[PDB]
Amino acid sequence: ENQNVNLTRKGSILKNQEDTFAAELHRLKQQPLFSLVDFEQVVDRIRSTVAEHLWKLMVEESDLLGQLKIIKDFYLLGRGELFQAFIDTAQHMLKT
Amino acid sequence: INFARMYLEQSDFHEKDVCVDRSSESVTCQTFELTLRSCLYPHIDKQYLD
Numbered sequence: 001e002n003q004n005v006n007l008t009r010k011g012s013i014l015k016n017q018e019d020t021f022a023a024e025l026h027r028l029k030q031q032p033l034f035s036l037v038d039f040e041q042v043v044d045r046i047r048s049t050v051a052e053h054l055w056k057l058m059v060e061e062s063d064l065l066g067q068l069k070i071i072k073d074f075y076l077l078g079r080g081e082l083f084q085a086f087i088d089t090a091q092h093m094l095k096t
Numbered sequence: 097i098n099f100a101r102m103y104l105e106q107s108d109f110h111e112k113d114v115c116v117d118r119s120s121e122s123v124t125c126q127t128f129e130l131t132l133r134s135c136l137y138p139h140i141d142k143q144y145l146d
Binding site for chain 1: 123
């Protein structure tokens with residue numbers, strides 16, 4: 001929800017299955033006994049659907065790979081020659 | 097026509113709701129603010145945009 005607040009109206013991860021999970025919750029409400037097992041099963045199904053859509057969003061929509069490559073180049077000094085030249089230039093400034 | 101209105105149309109004048117009950121789908125009924133946002137606010141925003 002917080003991302004859809006900033007992200008354009010990208011629908012629920014569960015989309016039309018959200019209502020399906022609502023129906024499952026209504027069935028749970030119709031259950032005469034509260035079973036933690038069935039509740040956890042439904043929660044895990046919803047979680048898995050959400051997690052798969054989130055992974056898709058992260059990799060394609062949020063370009064996790066590009067960010068990881070950036071982190072490698074900068075945080076992990078992937079551009080080692082670049083940071084070497086930077087050190088070579090900044091050595092006199094940073095010695096003080 | 098005059099006599100029809102005064103007698104026959106007078107005789108044949110047997111010309112004698114928003115079910116806002118949450119009871120049906122209370123679990124599926126949106127919150128009052130959520131229901132408002134989804135039924136009124138989207139339409140209000142549409143008219144505003146137009």
